[model samples]
Target: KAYLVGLYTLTPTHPGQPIQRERHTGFPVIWGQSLKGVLRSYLKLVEKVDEEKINKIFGPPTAGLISVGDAKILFFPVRSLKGVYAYVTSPLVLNRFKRDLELAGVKNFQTEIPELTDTAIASEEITVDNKVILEEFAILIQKDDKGILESVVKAIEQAFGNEMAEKIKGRIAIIPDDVFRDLVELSTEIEEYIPSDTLFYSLILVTPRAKDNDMALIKEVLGKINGKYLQIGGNETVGKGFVKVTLKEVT
Candidate 1:
């Protein structure tokens, strides 16, 4: 099955090591190969699966069994004028990540996510007068329950589990592409450093025949970590580097 995996920053994160950036935009992302290696190591670290099965499953790269995508930014971390912080994402972010959906077999998202001007598509309770500020920009918002917004929320909810997903309904803002770019450029900077609850998501695509039932072996790697906490990067005893994992099959 193909899937959308949500990696939640369960803590302040990083200086867990360095960062990975998409050159064209300077936005942060997790490398696909590295994420794949992390999964492989998790299975090995736990030593739960049979040795022979592990060899058959991931021995020669994907082996037509599974592949992971470089996780892209879903929401940029930002503080609000009120509350503590309100998240922001863009029309481009919604659409750019949509490509992964197609690769993962979600051909349609039910509604086309509309583009935005500087207008902020703010969710309820996130702003006063539906106007919110992040960084140095003041985004005046409007109310509307767009289906695309609903769909995006549903996807996050499905992959983020009930607890984390609940945060979406009242505290997100869809800003203009340019503003979002500026904000994301520093989404991990200072007042923005990889804060807890930040979200980055990718797909887990398992392609090809399962005649050998080796899918079980792949699940062995997946199951132990799904929706659970695991320490990452070069920090273990710090209590700040664990990332929570959760996924929803994108069938």
Candidate 2:
């Protein structure tokens, strides 16, 4: 069994739903079908895998041996008082990530996760003395926290690498889940097509098949895609879903 985790950072308009009140929360998500389509596009445009191979990999019109799960939110960039912005995560978010890691059989990266309070702020470097102010809500951080942010940084660096690790360092902030949810709801760019500064990930499961090394083939393809920034979702020409795609292997 193999697990491939994809981390996607949105560079442009993210996603939106209709209805005013329902739009609250600005839920950013990519359906499994959408992810499959994006991967297929990559294979067709770049890998140029033959139609037969594509059919075999994707199972042609019905279902494929490869399964793509819904892209889950890992980090949501938020306004910061010290740094320009910080990728924020809540206890709820971290717990979800931990469960997924376990399910994927990924091991040895867990660390102490800190608790957040309504007024507490967890950051990589900023402290109470910094007197930071959040941009969107102008939320002020009167207290300093680091345990959760450090643990997350350690896990991210191990899973992703320094490229992302350095970027996230001193830029992670922990807020109460409820407060963070409100930020996510109000911060999303509804009319902008796709919101920016959103990060999402998904799991890819390669079901056993008759073909030898089918899993290896998928792995190879994903490995090749480890660092490339690709256009995903809709409205690419106008820059809707430009995202950096990263692959991490588990188990």
Candidate 3:
């Protein structure tokens, strides 16, 4: 869709559509502000972590291999699982987590192989019974700060036209209480149009590993897919990772 100046469509234009060299409140600002907050809130919910826990986890975001600017946060939705989801922004914390698992006499923390484990594991998957239990720490890209929201607004304006982007920039309440119910319902509805054999699937992901540069690449990849794409991901995340990925192919 001619993305070269697509960003321009997201911001306001001046006389003769000269395209303001800078608006001060575009993607750069939003990436710096709102996205950070969403990541922060989400991770806090998952980790049940406090200020002290954060310090103990990584000893300041900057000190670790992955720098989250002390104020940054991350969320790991499927932490114990392999490949399906394993994203975190903090390289330092990631390294520490891996080390702790090994030292704690739980070597097979990430795998199903019993012999490789240092301790007996209770379950094969990290989350069972459709519930997700988080670890000791949470990511926090957003805070009770003000500038982040303002920058988010600017980013919205820059990403989509001001009017439409503004409409989609904020949060909305999810209707169903059952986590998988939405997936089941969407699948039933989608099957009506798409062939039954098509590998249509949907998933919700939480990752602290995602970066600002990752967003554009994600969109680019999604845009190229020869099927329907819907991003119904959630919000209030402490760390920014990918989300609500849905795909379906038509006959």
What are the clash counts of all predictions, listed in order?
A: 0, 6, 26
Name the runs in model 1 displaced over 4 angstroms. Answer: 15-18, 60-64, 145-147, 189-193
* Candidate maximizing lDDT: 1
By TM-score, how accurate is candidate 1?
Answer: 0.86
Ten contiguous residues minimizing lDDT sum, candidate 2: 14-23
lDDT of 1 at 26: 73
User: What is candidate 2's lDDT per residue for 71-179, written digit by digit as tens?
Assistant: 7777777666667677777777777778777766777657655555645455636444534455645444634344556667788876666677777777677667787
TM-score of 3: 0.18
Give the TM-score of each candidate.
0.86, 0.84, 0.18
- Over 4 Å off in model 2, which ranges? 15-26, 119-121, 128-132, 136-146, 190-194, 208-212
How much is the lDDT of residue 161 in candidate 2? Answer: 65
Top candidate on TM-score is 1
Model 2: lDDT of residue 193: 42
Query: Per-residue lDDT of 1-251 in model 3, one digit per residue for the tens?
Result: 11101111111111111111114311011122222233334334543456543343233433211122111111112232322222111222223333433433323324221121111112223333432222331221212123322443353343223653343233211111122122222322120221111111111121346455544433333233212222111221422123321221111
Residue pairs that clash (backbone atoms under 3 angstroms), model 2:
13-194, 13-195, 14-194, 14-195, 81-132, 81-133
* Candidate 3 whole-model C-alpha lDDT, 0 to 1: 0.25
Put down candidate 1 lDDT per residue, 1-251, tens digits, no spaces.
77678777777665223566788887778788877766666666664666556556556454536777887778766888765687678888887777667767776564566677857777666677768878567888866556555676776666556766687656778888888887766656452346676788888777677654666666755666677665555455767656877766554
lDDT of each: 0.70, 0.65, 0.25
Model 1 pairs in collision: none
Question: So what's the TM-score on candidate 2?
Answer: 0.84
